[PDB]
């Protein structure tokens, strides 16, 4: 059985390995050059959690990826003047996540696909698809075009997928775009600076500031990659529109992030040389065209990054697609069932990612008592009352079920605290009863 995959990023390389391993004839096309060919040219990080780690585990690559990953035990919150505060992510060191360099991951996955027998072809970008004739057109940076025949086409070509554009002209995909008002910019902290300011290596760092914020993830050599999230446009308010050059960015950091600015030795140059990125949420009602083509990963469901689950979801998609294709009656059956299974879960993580943004800078007295009570209920009923962050991050429960269980827990906590000043007035034994009455064990 034959397949053509567009995009050798994270989902495309993983599905290529899983199908080649099963004896499929796989051809993978990528517009960038091969990153494994060392050049004289001169650092993006991601958070790997259980969903992505489990996908790599099935592919037999987890140990190689984790050997180059830095453990993050929790969230380190910075407010000027005050000492940083560590919020642990899990119950113990079994529940942690991992900072992995994006380029390192992609190189490991590329080697793994070739080892399984897939053929990879770089410097070729997909331009268009002719579905009636089963041919597609690719081009190099020098504009020269060539044509190829295909039997099955997998769009793994990212948030700006050309496969999706071609599909949307022969079927109605129910596309809807929800634009995000924030852009982002990447900046660097050196190993020297991070040591000098005693920045904890085994944590994710965040500088909240309401409508804008900064995060930082660690690297193996003790450097950190910093990401600024800030509105493109002002309604007045700060925004990328007012930051005309690196010197303006420096003044903004010294005023709004005064304890982070001294760590950013190359702020001015990074700001002017790295491009400002865009964010969005894009939802589709269907991900396939008959038995001829299918989408996965960011090509199917771009999401805002505030839960750190886009790569984790894409790798989970790749496992599912390979399973459906291996055992279905025919490609058309496989693609319809893949869409039916994954699209409701992709929709749910898209919604939870947006909610995490508000959840994190955007403080309440009710919220405090609710969280005090939820910890008690998780200690008394560890099998039933499980924080939604844990369900999303450390389990493989379908996203839609994680969201539903999270909703029941929030309603129980709301009614339990309503019109109570503090825990002294609440009948904990009675709350525990409702927990058992409404939440089945897992
Ligand atoms: C700022 C930021 C932070 C994030 N942090 C996290 C995090 O902590 N954890 C997490 O899990 N996710 C995170 N994500 C999301 C994650 O990066 C993506 O969801 C993930 O990379 C999607 O993988 P993919 O294989 O579907 O797409 P990609 O990784 O983008 O791969 C697409 C590939 O297709 C190629 N391509 C594109 N167009 C064509 C074409 N026409 N022809 C041929 N090839 C083409 C591209 O060059 C690329 O190689 C973050 C995203 C952003 C923007
Ligand atoms: C880009 C990014 C990646 C993430 C997280 C966040 C905020 C961001 Cl902005 N988080 C969420 C959290 O701490 O609630 C994680 O867990 C780890 O992946
Ligand atoms: Cl993400």
Swiss-Prot record:
Optimum pH is 8.5. It catalyses: L-kynurenine + NADPH + O2 + H(+) = 3-hydroxy-L-kynurenine + NADP(+) + H2O. Its cofactor is FAD. GO terms for biological process: anthranilate metabolic process; kynurenine metabolic process; L-tryptophan catabolic process; NAD biosynthetic process; NAD metabolic process; quinolinate biosynthetic process. It comes from the Bacteria. Pathway: Cofactor biosynthesis; NAD(+) biosynthesis; quinolinate from L-kynurenine: step 1/3; Siderophore biosynthesis; quinolobactin biosynthesis. FAD binds at residues 10-11, 30-32, 47, 102, 126, 298, 311-312. SUPFAM superfamilies: FAD/NAD(P)-binding domain. GO terms for molecular function: FAD binding; kynurenine 3-monooxygenase activity; NAD(P)H oxidase H2O2-forming activity. Changing residue 389 to F: Decreases kynurenine 3-monooxygenase activity. Signal peptide: none annotated. InterPro entries: FAD-bd (IPR002938), FAD/NAD-bd_sf (IPR036188), Kynurenine_monooxygenase (IPR027545). Catalyzes the hydroxylation of L-kynurenine (L-Kyn) to form 3-hydroxy-L-kynurenine (L-3OHKyn). Probably required for the synthesis of quinolinic acid and the siderophore quinolobactin. Belongs to the aromatic-ring hydroxylase family. KMO subfamily. This is Kynurenine 3-monooxygenase. It comes from Pseudomonas fluorescens.
């Amino acid at each position: 059985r034959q397949v053509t995959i567009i995009g050798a990023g994270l989902a495309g390389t993983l599905v290529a390995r899983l199908l080649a391993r099963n004896g499929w004839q796989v051809n993978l096309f990528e517009r960038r050059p091969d990153p494994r060919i060392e050049t004289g040219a001169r650092s993006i990080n991601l958070a790997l959690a259980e969903r992505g780690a489990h996908a790599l585990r099935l592919a037999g690559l987890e140990r190689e990826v984790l050997a180059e990953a830095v453990m993050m035990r929790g969230r380190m919150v910075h407010v000027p003047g005050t000492p940083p505060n560590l919020q642990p992510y899990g119950r113990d060191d079994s529940e942690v996540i991992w900072s992995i360099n994006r380029d390192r991951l992609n190189r490991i996955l590329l080697d793994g696909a070739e080892a399984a027998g897939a053929s990879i072809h770089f410097n070729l970008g997909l331009d268009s698809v002719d579905f009636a004739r089963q041919r597609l057109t690719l081009s190099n940076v020098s504009g020269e075009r060539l044509e190829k025949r295909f039997h099955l086409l997998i769009g793994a070509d990212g948030c700006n997928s050309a496969v999706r554009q071609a599909m949307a002209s022969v079927v109605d995909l129910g596309e809807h775009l929800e634009t995000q008002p924030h852009g982002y910019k990447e900046l660097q902290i050196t190993p020297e600076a991070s040591a000098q300011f005693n920045l904890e290596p085994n944590a994710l760092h965040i500088w909240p500031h309401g409508d804008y914020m900064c995060i930082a993830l660690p690297n193996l050599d003790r450097s950190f990659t910093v990401t600024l999230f800030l509105h493109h446009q002002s309604p007045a308010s700060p925004s990328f529109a007012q930051l005309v050059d690196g010197h303006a960015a420096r003044r903004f950091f010294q005023r709004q992030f005064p304890d982070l600015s001294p760590m950013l030795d190359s702020l001015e140059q990074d700001f002017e040389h790295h491009p400002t990125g865009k964010l969005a949420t894009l939802r589709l009602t269907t991900w396939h065209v008959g038995g001829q083509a299918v989408l996965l990963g960011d090509a199917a469901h771009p999401m805002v990054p505030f839960h750190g689950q886009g790569m984790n979801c894409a790798l989970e998609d790749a496992v599912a697609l390979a399973e459906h294709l291996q055992s279905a009656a025919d490609n058309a059956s496989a693609l319809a069932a893949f869409t039916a299974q994954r699209q409701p879960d992709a929709l749910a993580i898209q919604a939870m990612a947006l909610e995490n943004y508000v959840e994190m800078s955007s403080a309440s007295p009710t919220y405090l008592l609710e969280r005090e009570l939820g910890q008690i209920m998780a200690q008394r009923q560890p099998t039933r009352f499980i924080p939604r962050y844990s369900m999303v991050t450390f389990s493989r429960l379908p996203y839609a079920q994680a969201m539903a269980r999270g909703q029941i827990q929030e309603q129980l906590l709301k009614f339990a605290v309503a019109n109570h000043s503090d825990l002294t007035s609440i009948n904990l034994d009675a709350v525990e009863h409702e927990v058992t009455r409404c939440l089945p064990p897992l």
